[PDB]
Amino acid sequence: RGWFDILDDWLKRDRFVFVGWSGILLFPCAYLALGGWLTGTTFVTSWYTHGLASSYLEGCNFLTVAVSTPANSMGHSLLLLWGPEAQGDFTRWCQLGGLWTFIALHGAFGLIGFMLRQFEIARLVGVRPYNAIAFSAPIAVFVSVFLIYPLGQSSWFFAPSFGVAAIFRFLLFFQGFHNWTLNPFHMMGVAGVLGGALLCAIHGATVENTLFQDGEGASTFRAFNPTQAEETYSMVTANRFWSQIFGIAFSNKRWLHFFMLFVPVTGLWMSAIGVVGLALNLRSYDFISQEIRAAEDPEFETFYTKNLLLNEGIRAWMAPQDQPHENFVFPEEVLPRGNAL
Amino acid sequence: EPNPNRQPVELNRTSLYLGLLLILVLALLFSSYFFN
Amino acid sequence: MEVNQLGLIATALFVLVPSVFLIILYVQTESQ
């Protein structure tokens, strides 16, 4: 047995936490993304990059701490610790944003490792790798939003910072600058996420409410043996209920669980396409016909035009502080505002 | 000399219904953007 | 409304072509 085959044996051992070859990528990169996030939300500022406090140390709480994006002036720099910006100085690396690339890139590689793990375990156990295929959708989101989107913009600054309220800010930036709610690719994503949650709940409640009586207790969870042959609920009564309630029903158990995979997986992929567009500011921002009419007819108003006025508010009121490196100075008198407010 | 790899293709009624719904809803969604 | 007049034909073919494809496959299925 060559040394390779001996290392194989030991990595694929049946232990409480399976390791595998995939583990050599997964466990270091995931621990470090995780660890770097905890370390940065606990101790590190965004003062020199953003003009913001961002750690428990500074007095932020769980919702407002972030590992924030590096300054716009770093461009798309990898911000290696031994690179030309930090020159190996750990303290300066933190101050310039290096934990953000540290987390971004180790997480990228940890997600790879996680998918390979799904493949590795599926192969050894003998099942089809549909779960690994499903995890493709989270990877499309992560790469589109955290990597591609900033690489199309001026710098990593405009990617999402890793924090609860930093991500909320990202949502609203996307409304005010990109009119992202109007984007059909986001709309398909919404449909797949909301329809996924719908499928989740309706399949769970249906099975729980068509159970066969397989024990004599009022707690029905004990009447299931994982080695049993029999379906624990009735497809036939489920199908009749839903045919009569909603008009159609699943009749095929396999199609039903394939559909549960498909719907949310396909939603996240569509949303990712849209974000690649926004990487280039290729937005679905306007409807030309509405604008030609509105410009000429001051009595024409729709919810489309109302929403753009709100976008205009968000941009002017938020840009100076959100993009401090632009030195935006907006006198009171230029700020768009309606009456009184 | 007929080719032994030929296979017949199938699409059941339920797949037609699902497929038509997909197309119609995609059209209703994208049509606004096509007219712009 | 000053809409894109190529939108009518894009929308129409968007529907017709894939729908025809499905119909063709379904009917030849029902006859074998």
């Binding site: 045919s243 008009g247 | 059941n12 119609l24 | 809409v3």
Partner: peptide
Amino acid sequence: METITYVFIFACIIALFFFAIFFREPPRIT
């Protein structure tokens, strides 16, 4: 033309609903 188009597509969906319910493949117990 644009109004007609949106209404046509909506109308086709409603007709699809009717056939998918009343003219479905009936489920049987094989």
